Amino acid sequence: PVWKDADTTLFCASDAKAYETEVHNVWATHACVPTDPNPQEIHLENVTENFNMWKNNMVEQMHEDIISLWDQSLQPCVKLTGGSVIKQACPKISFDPIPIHYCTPAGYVILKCNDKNFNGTGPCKNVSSVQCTHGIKPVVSTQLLLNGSLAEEEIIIRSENLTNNAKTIIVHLNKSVEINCTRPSNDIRKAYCEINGTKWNKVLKQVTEKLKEHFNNKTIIFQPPSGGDLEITMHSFNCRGEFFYCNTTQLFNNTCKGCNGTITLPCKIKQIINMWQGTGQAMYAPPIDGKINCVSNITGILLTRDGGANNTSNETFRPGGGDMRDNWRSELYKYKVVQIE
C-alpha cells in the first residue's frame, strides 16, 4: 500500500433514471456511469494523512461538471455576455438535483478522512480508501448551504485562514433547520420562506458559541451583507427551475424576547439573473403556474468577516456566497485523490 498526492481526471456515477426528463437525470445518464453496485471502504491501519480542502482539485472538477450540467439544461431566453447577446429557446424544465458520485480511474484511489472533528485542513488520523465519494447533490445557492450533509459531532468552522478577513468561512451545522419556500398558486413573482425561528435562533446561538471559541471569547455579532448584487445580498437559490431571492435580514438580526414563532422571509422570483457560471446576465421565462414549493435542509452557512477591527471589542459576520466552489468544498472536504505509487 504505497501512494503519493496526485491529480487526475475523475469520472462520475449516479442513479439517474433513463426514462426521467428531469435535467440532472438527463445529464447523468449520458455523462456518468451507474453507481457502484458494491461499494467497498478499506480502512488504513495507523495511517495519518494530511488533507487540505482549500487546495483540492476535486472541487475544481465538480465545478466544471455543474457548469456543463447547467449549460445544457437551464437554457436562458437571452444570454448577455461580453457585448454579444444571444436569444435561444427557454422552455420550462424539470429541475431537482440528484446525488453525483466522483470516482477515480485505475491507478488512483480516493482517501477519506473519518475524524469526526476534522476542520478541512491538517492531519487526519482515521483514514480510509474508497473508489468513489458518497453522493453529493450539486445545490447552487448563496448564504445558506442546502440539502447537504451534516457534521457528525459539533458545529465545525472551516476556513483557509481565519485570521484573514477576506477568507470565506463555512459553518458546518450538526442539526439541520428546514426552510420551506412557496410561491402560492393564487404578483406571480412574490413568494416567501418559512423557518421555525425557535429552531433557527437556537442553532444560531450555538454558532456564535463556536465562533467565540475561535475568536477569543469576543463578542460575536451578525449583520446583513454590506452591499453587492442581489445574488449576494439575498439568499439566492433555484427551486423547480425558478430563481428565488430571499431577504434573510430576519435570520441575521442579533435581537434573538418575544421572537420565537415562525419566521416568514420575503422572497422574489427573479427572471433576470447574474450568472454564477460565467460573468453575464441571463433572462428566463416567468414562473410556472400553481403552487411552487421547495422544502430544503439548511446544512451550513457561508460567512464573511468584517475586516479592520482588531482593536474593536467584537467581530461581526455577514452572509456571503457567490463562488459556488465553496458549495462543492463543503462536501468534498473529507476527500483527496492519491496515485498508487
Ligand SMILES: N=C(N)N1CCC[C@H]1C(=O)N1CCN(C(=O)N2C[C@H](CO)C[C@H](C(=O)Nc3ccc(Cl)c(F)c3)C2)CC1
Ligand atoms: N468561476 C470561476 N472560475 N471564478 C474565478 C474567480 C471568480 C469566478 C468567476 O469568474 N465567476 C463567478 C460567478 N460570477 C459572478 O459574477 N457573480 C456575481 C453575481 C452578482 O453580480 C452573482 C454570482 C452568483 O452567485 N449567481 C447566482 C445565480 C443564481 C443562483 Cl440560484 C445563485 F445561487 C447564484 C457570483 C461570474 C464568474
Ligand SMILES: *[C@@H]1O[C@H](CO)[C@@H](O)[C@H](O)[C@H]1NC(C)=O
Ligand atoms: C474511524 O472511522 C470509521 C469509519 O470508517 C468508524 O468506524 C469510526 O468513526 C472510526 N473508528 C476507528 C477504529 O478509527
Ligand SMILES: *[C@@H]1O[C@H](CO)[C@@H](O)[C@H](O)[C@H]1NC(C)=O
Ligand atoms: C484546523 O485544524 C488544524 C489542526 O491541524 C489547525 O492548524 C487549523 O488552524 C484549524 N483551522 C480552523 C479554521 O479551525
Ligand SMILES: *[C@@H]1O[C@H](CO)[C@@H](O)[C@H](O)[C@H]1NC(C)=O
Ligand atoms: C433533511 O434532514 C433530515 C434530518 O436532519 C433527514 O432525515 C432528511 O433526509 C433530510 N432531507 C434532505 C432532502 O436531505
Ligand SMILES: *[C@@H]1O[C@H](CO)[C@@H](O)[C@H](O)[C@H]1NC(C)=O
Ligand atoms: C452541535 O454542536 C454544538 C457545539 O458546536 C453542541 O453544543 C450541540 O449539542 C451539538 N448538537 C448535536 C445534536 O450534536
Ligand SMILES: *[C@@H]1O[C@H](CO)[C@@H](O)[C@H](O)[C@H]1NC(C)=O
Ligand atoms: C493568515 O492571514 C493573515 C492576515 O491576512 C496573515 O497575516 C497570515 O500570515 C496568514 N496565515 C497563513 C498561514 O497564511
Ligand SMILES: *[C@@H]1O[C@H](CO)[C@@H](O)[C@H](O)[C@H]1NC(C)=O
Ligand atoms: C410549507 O409551507 C406551505 C405554505 O406555508 C404549507 O402549505 C406546507 O404544508 C408546508 N410544508 C411543510 C413540509 O411544512
Ligand SMILES: *[C@@H]1O[C@H](CO)[C@@H](O)[C@H](O)[C@H]1NC(C)=O
Ligand atoms: C419549532 O422547533 C421546535 C424545536 O425544534 C419544536 O419543538 C416546535 O414544535 C417547532 N414549531 C413548529 C411550529 O413546528
Ligand SMILES: *[C@@H]1O[C@H](CO)[C@@H](O)[C@H](O)[C@H]1NC(C)=O
Ligand atoms: C431586507 O429587508 C430589510 C428590512 O425590511 C431591508 O431593510 C433591506 O434593505 C432588505 N434587503 C434588500 C437587499 O433589499
Ligand SMILES: *[C@@H]1O[C@H](CO)[C@@H](O)[C@H](O)[C@H]1NC(C)=O
Ligand atoms: C432539497 O431536497 C428536497 C427533497 O429532495 C427537494 O424537494 C428540494 O427542492 C431541495 N431543495 C433545493 C434548493 O434543491
